[PDB]
Design a protein around this ligand. Structure first.
Ligand code: HEM
Ligand code: TZM
Ligand code: TZM
Length: 394
């Protein structure tokens, strides 16, 4: 006898497991067991991933209900799982979305200058350099302090919550509450701090005193700062780190982008498509009985949308493991989700990666791994796949 197939399959973010293509061909929706012991439906084709993400009866907010089958334990309060819904209900969606575009005057120049400074520091110090801890993550942290309007020197302490806040655990995590309550207290103080007049927190601070928002809670305003910092920094830092591995493993591409930097946006879009940064499928709870493929999903069941299942589906993306800059459907991947919950940071995340890559390739055109790739240490039981260190030379 064997036990029911367990998820996730592997924490390694440098290769896709052969099980994904076997599932997708043979059983593109099938039952699995999560780390909590709950059963769930794992969906792994482009067609069925899109179906689930476009039908709101597969609900994100209902995954927080008491007694539901769970992918992992909550690391935030349960109402926060409906964060963007709560922001829309408070009349804040347009303003939040506006503050996190990469379009603010000076923002791109600030990203380039920050990237170049970080890279000059590594060159001065000499190889090997850790491109996660000393490049991608500080670049994401600096970006988010600037986008929020908060001091750059507060970024490192906020960032050190993230190795716990984004855990994917079978059980509640006591440190996640300690850090959440401290970070909410910090963001509440930011809303009271007259120096904070720019970025997302400067805008929320003004709207908070405007009569049209007088009954929006201070808790929601503070929660927007904590959740957008955390989700944006973990998502951009982890994506850029694993994208740099994919790039370094393709010297030909590396060299093409270095020669013809105008191709960096197309290269980043393919790097998004093939990215393994999400460690788990996106969870949803069925609110009705719904046919998905050969399975009737029942009300109350958990469904997990496997992004690499969609993004490596050869019926949508022929030769899915190859980066091809001339695809006719280049942005149709699911790296930013799809439907109601499509990522509102998508433009920002694209620009962080494009600028980080352009700066790296101009400063370190000969970048290469400084250790055999199998020697990277992949973080486990986490919502992202990331190497603990990314040692390079040039
Ligand atoms: C390369 C970087 C990023 C990737 C790959 C990414 C990916 C995603 C994905 C897959 C979702 C959908 C989740 C779901 O449907 O269950 C999402 C939603 C979200 N993302 Fe991102 N993200 C990135 C950057 C950012 C940034 C920069 C921010 C904010 C500063 C951000 C904030 C959010 C929020 C608030 C949601 C929830 C939206 C909703 O529920 O309507 N993300 N992101
Ligand atoms: N209030 C709060 C904030 C963040 C996370 C949680 C869930 N949890 C409860 N104990 C450990 N984690 C509860
Ligand atoms: N960037 C990202 C990816 C997956 C899930 C989320 C959810 N979120 C909503 N508010 C903060 N985080 C955000």
């Amino acid at each position: 006898a064997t036990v029911l197939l367990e998820v996730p399959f592997s924490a390694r973010g440098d290769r896709i497991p052969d099980a994904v293509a076997e599932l997708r061909t043979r059983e593109p929706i099938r039952k699995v067991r999560t780390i909590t012991g709950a059963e769930a439906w794992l969906v792994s084709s482009y067609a069925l991933c899109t179906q689930v993400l476009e039908d709101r009866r597969f609900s994100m907010k209902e995954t927080a209900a008491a007694g539901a089958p769970r992918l992992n334990a909550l690391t935030v309060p349960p109402e926060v799982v409906n964060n963007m819904g709560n922001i829309a209900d408070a009349g804040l969606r347009k303003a939040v979305m506006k503050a996190i575009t990469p379009k603010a005057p000076g923002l791109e120049q600030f990203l380039r200058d920050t990237a170049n400074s970080l890279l000059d520091n590594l060159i001065t110090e000499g190889a090997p350099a850790d491109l996660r801890n000393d490049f991608a993550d500080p670049l994401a942290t600096a970006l988010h302090c600037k986008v929020l309007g908060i001091p750059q020197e507060d970024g490192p302490k906020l960032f050190r919550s993230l190795s716990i806040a984004f855990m994917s655990s079978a059980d509640p995590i006591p440190a996640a509450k300690i850090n959440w309550d401290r970070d909410i207290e910090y963001m509440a103080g930011i809303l009271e701090n007259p120096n904070i007049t720019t970025g997302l927190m400067g805008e929320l601070s003004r709207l908070r005193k405007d009569p049209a928002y007088s009954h929006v809670s201070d808790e929601l305003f503070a929660t927007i700062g904590v959740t957008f910092f955390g989700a944006g920094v973990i998502s951009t830092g982890s994506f850029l780190t694993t994208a740099l591995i994919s790039l370094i493993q393709r010297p030909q591409l590396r060299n093409l982008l270095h020669e013809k930097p105008e191709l960096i946006p197309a290269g980043v879009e393919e790097l998004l498509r093939i990215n393994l940064s999400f460690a788990d499928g996106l969870p949803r709870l069925a609110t009705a009985d719904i046919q998905v493929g050969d399975v009737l999903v029942r009300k109350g069941e958990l469904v997990l949308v496997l992004l690499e299942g969609a993004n490596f589906d050869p019926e949508h993306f022929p030769n899915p493991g190859s980066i091809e800059l001339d695809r006719p459907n280049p942005t149709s991947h699911l790296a930013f989700g799809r439907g109601q919950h499509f990522c509102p940071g998508s433009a920002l995340g694209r620009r962080h990666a494009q600028i980080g890559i352009e700066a790296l390739l101009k400063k370190m055109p000969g970048v290469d791994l400084a250790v055999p790739i199998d020697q990277l240490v992949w973080r486990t039981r986490f919502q992202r796949r990331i190497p603990e260190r990314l040692p390079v030379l040039w």
